[PDB]
Amino acid sequence: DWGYDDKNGPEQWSKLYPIANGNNQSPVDIKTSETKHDTSLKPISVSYNPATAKEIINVGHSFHVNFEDNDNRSVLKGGPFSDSYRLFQFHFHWGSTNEHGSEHTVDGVKYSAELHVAHWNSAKYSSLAEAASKADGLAVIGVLMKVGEANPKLQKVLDALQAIKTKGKRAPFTNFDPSTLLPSSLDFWTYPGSLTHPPLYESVTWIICKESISVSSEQLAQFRSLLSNVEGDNAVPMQHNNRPTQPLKGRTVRASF
Amino acid sequence: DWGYDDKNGPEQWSKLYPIANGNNQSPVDIKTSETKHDTSLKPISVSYNPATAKEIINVGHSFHVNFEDNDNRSVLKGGPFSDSYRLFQFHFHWGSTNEHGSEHTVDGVKYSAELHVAHWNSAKYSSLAEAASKADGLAVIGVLMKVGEANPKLQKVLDALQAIKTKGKRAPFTNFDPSTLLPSSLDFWTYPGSLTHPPLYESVTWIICKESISVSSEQLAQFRSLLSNVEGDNAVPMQHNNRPTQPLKGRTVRASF
């Protein structure tokens, strides 16, 4: 139905998902000379319980690490939020080559990949399903991933991918605290935005970290060696899944710093 | 340089390696109706000592498993041979899809991949460096691989690929008997031929197995997820390394069966 090829990719998504041309679409270019430093922004607080880590899935366009979200063992607080948000998933976006692959850009600079750590508002809603399409329903941390030194913090994730090479495969994925993937400093930009693929809900408060994390060209090759086809079919490696930046349409990107 | 691209591939090899146009070039199409039964052909005897297994290396166009060749712990004889031939290497050839990856063809049928188990004449010569260019220097078993069920005999080889992802990377590879990769029956065809890539020496007596072995689509994808680039550079996956069949130029393909 949708993907990242010319026939089915980001420039055609509006045919099934009209919000694709909406006014709070993500990702965006962060122009640093136009960010408002906001004094009321408190530090970001993550407290993740590695026990909430549940499984790793191949979803054909990407792979997902999902978390038990039945209670408040793993939460994000602070920043612009009064509410606690419940960890439910992390995943990555990458590009065909190392020169692009991030979704978010900073001063028009494209990075090699992007981590998304996704949370839902359990103070206001009782489920992800209820939260997912509310303006205040999702909190997502974006981390820009800069091609360089191999990132050993990625290691448990990349070692698990051999178990889920083809679309539909899943394996348990336990005892993992995704805060171990976050940069050293949680200084951040925040703007009201969307999911970066279908269903593209304008439900996301973004926390884009100013600090990047490393990844080697060979760790990126591991992502791209993952297959979009089902077991038995001809291999179609997942070459890219990064959406181009979208118009800010008058939104303000606030800095914590 | 040489490779398998439109730039440096099999159709321009003759520029740097003029023997590419020779009269004993490999691979060839084996036409079952034209093969001659030779009553002098003995059964092929392989006995390989798993302790000769030394190392696995990414050589850019392929990966090689190399064996200690200082004695005759690991030998080929029988078939058309008066001499004993010392195991030194096995490796594979594959194609960009699963339909076309073998080098030899049988009645024009292309298989998905091909195993080469390479030996040098330790009766007439004292090293590989020496034997490599002698008409009677090399003996190579070629097994055709047919896409189908996962081949569990490939498991140790495929498990080792994660340690040699980029060109020049090598790792220990020990305690392996590659006769485990051969089909049950060692009924064969034999013809005089060449190395199937540069330096393309007409030094090879081929033993082409009548029986194929299996390989899965996902095992072939693991071959193709090896990188031809050096560490640090942008990932270039190894998509194919099979040479087109060459003119038979009046050679007789003998059958053991």
Ligand SMILES: [O][B]1([O])O[C][C]C2=[C][C]=C([N]C(=S)[N][C]C3=[C][C]=[C][C]=[C]3)[C]=C21
């Ligand atoms: O990169 B992204 O698109 O946008 C950024 C945040 C994000 C978070 C999670 C996910 N993962 C899934 S399964 N998305 C589907 C979904 C999510 C919620 C409700 C219905 C449906 C994707 C994204």
Ligand SMILES: [O][B]1([O])O[C][C]C2=[C][C]=C([N]C(=S)[N][C]C3=[C][C]=[C][C]=[C]3)[C]=C21
């Ligand atoms: O498929 B093939 O080309 O041709 C078929 C047999 C074969 C055997 C070994 C190898 N592997 C190497 S390292 N080849 C290089 C070489 C150079 C000089 C002397 C020896 C060997 C390759 C082949």
Ligand SMILES: [Zn+2]
């Ligand atoms: Zn995402």
Ligand SMILES: [Zn+2]
């Ligand atoms: Zn070969």
